[PDB]
Design a protein around this ligand. Sequence first.
Ligand SMILES: CC(C)(C)c1ccc(N(C(=O)c2c[nH]cn2)[C@@H](C(=O)NC2CCCCC2)c2cccnc2)cc1
Ligand SMILES: [Cl-]
Ligand SMILES: [Cl-]
Ligand code: NA
Lengths: 305, 306
Amino acid sequence: SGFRKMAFPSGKVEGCMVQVTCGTTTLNGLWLDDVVYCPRHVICTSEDMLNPNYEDLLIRKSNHNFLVQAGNVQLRVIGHSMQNCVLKLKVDTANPKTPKYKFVRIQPGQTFSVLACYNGSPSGVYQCAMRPNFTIKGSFLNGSCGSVGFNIDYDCVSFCYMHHMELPTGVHAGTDLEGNFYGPFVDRQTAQAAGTDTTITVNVLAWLYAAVINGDRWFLNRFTTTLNDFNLVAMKYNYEPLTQDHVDILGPLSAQTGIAVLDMCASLKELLQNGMNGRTILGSALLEDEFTPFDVVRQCSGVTF
Amino acid sequence: SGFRKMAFPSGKVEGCMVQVTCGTTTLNGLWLDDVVYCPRHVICTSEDMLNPNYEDLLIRKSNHNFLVQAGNVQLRVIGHSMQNCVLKLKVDTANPKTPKYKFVRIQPGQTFSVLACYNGSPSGVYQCAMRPNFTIKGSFLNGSCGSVGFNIDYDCVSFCYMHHMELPTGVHAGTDLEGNFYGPFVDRQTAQAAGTDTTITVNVLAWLYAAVINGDRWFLNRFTTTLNDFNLVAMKYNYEPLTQDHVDILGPLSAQTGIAVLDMCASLKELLQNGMNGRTILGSALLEDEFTPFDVVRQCSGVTFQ
Ligand SMILES: CC(C)(C)c1ccc(N(C(=O)c2c[nH]cn2)[C@@H](C(=O)NC2CCCCC2)c2cccnc2)cc1
Ligand SMILES: [Cl-]
Ligand SMILES: [Cl-]
Ligand code: NA
């Protein structure tokens, strides 16, 4: 029993992190097979970052403009190219620690583990969610660019995020590993801001189920509701609309606990309208929305990798 | 910017986790060099749980009664010995993935990462703190026994916790890697219960300093306090006493932010009195006590957002 924010074991990803230097800029890269992936803004000076022409900046660069360091070993760069906002550096040595992996683009509301790295050295691991506004509330300092987010399914690492920048509110933005940004962001020093965020409703419901599984039941009541009536409450409180697909995904937890989704929706409806009355749920005074239904089942069932 | 519960990268520990089976019982062990460490209660049967005599149970075992599995490889046990509540199995193969490591016993309030494992296979990583009542608020299911807690400051793995059992309130008890329990607990099924727990005051203060570093000052006030007056008030909210050692430990964070330790104590006194009035601190609506001063320095910038 107990319930914690839990990350995937990070060992398979630790063995892929390297340091990439171009000029005076140093950040992190991901070394898979014989290619290193990193943010393309590594090639920019501070002058360039105000209005970069990445096409022209890269054609200027050559293989010898890039220094790749794996621990204490130098990797020789034998080619370079760009895919969207990601720079790809071909090296002469395949990473012998390359895990089984895929590149996957995730949806808002889905979670992943972040391995925060500095100078190519892993520093920490934590769990995040892709916010509805396509930011993540990470923990990153200068030099963290190129840190990656991932999920694991058995022995296969699904890479879904590469870190690129911090926004003025202190939240973070990045790309998938094919270099496509999550959210309406660009890799240049210009005026950019996170949009107004919303709460991930299906995840809050999942966490309420986790609370019931762990013995927290005070918020349950005799009432049920309908999607239409609940979604009018959701819009009132800047909660994401609850779809029929979400109801189906929560089906398992509904069957296990005896609280139909629309039964639990009646609990959440009341929590939004009345508050918590000084009480906590799973040790929180806020409604937590960064656990997915999958996260709850995994942690309450002990799945291993 | 940002502030998260952050665990250490777990790879160095992943390469040490193995499965240990004795009879019908399976749990996790920690394979370092040519020794596998695991809870000695792996040798308990159904009716040995109330009053086992581990010396009598172990003398009846042969090396081949212990099955150790490292992924797909069976490891041959060539000896065994008990150290307090830990069983040490000598195997014929040294772990080629053994990291630089040391065994440390920690004090209440200290934090560490936990690699939760089942059947010798890692499942997840999270951060914990040793509570004042010598339990941890973990996330552990059946078969998690033998999962370990650790820190990795400066490329050296300091193992500080091995998981043994769950208490009636759902919190968790275990030992250091020398097999000595944290707290008054024993590896028997007899009625034991965690004591009334308290809040780790020095950690709450560290986390308030983190909030200031990150750019938030709304909770400060114009007052100060004596150390004794602070403790008189804080103990009425079931906070642990703040000692001069704690005040000294907070010195560097006080210097970075310009807020005297006893001025931050005055802010905490007011937060306990008033609540947050709909606000949050570092994303929380409660006062968080599982970040240590050392943790805050590790994660936060060395430059305050003024
Ligand atoms: C023999 C002894 C010391 C009484 C014991 C027995 C079982 C276990 N538990 C194993 O899961 C377990 C043991 N061997 C393989 N799995 C579990 C456990 O503590 N239930 C308690 C039930 C009440 C009485 C005390 C034990 C467990 C569950 C969840 C997370 N952590 C552990 C731990 C200790
Ligand atoms: Cl461009
Ligand atoms: Cl300590
Ligand atoms: Na209901």
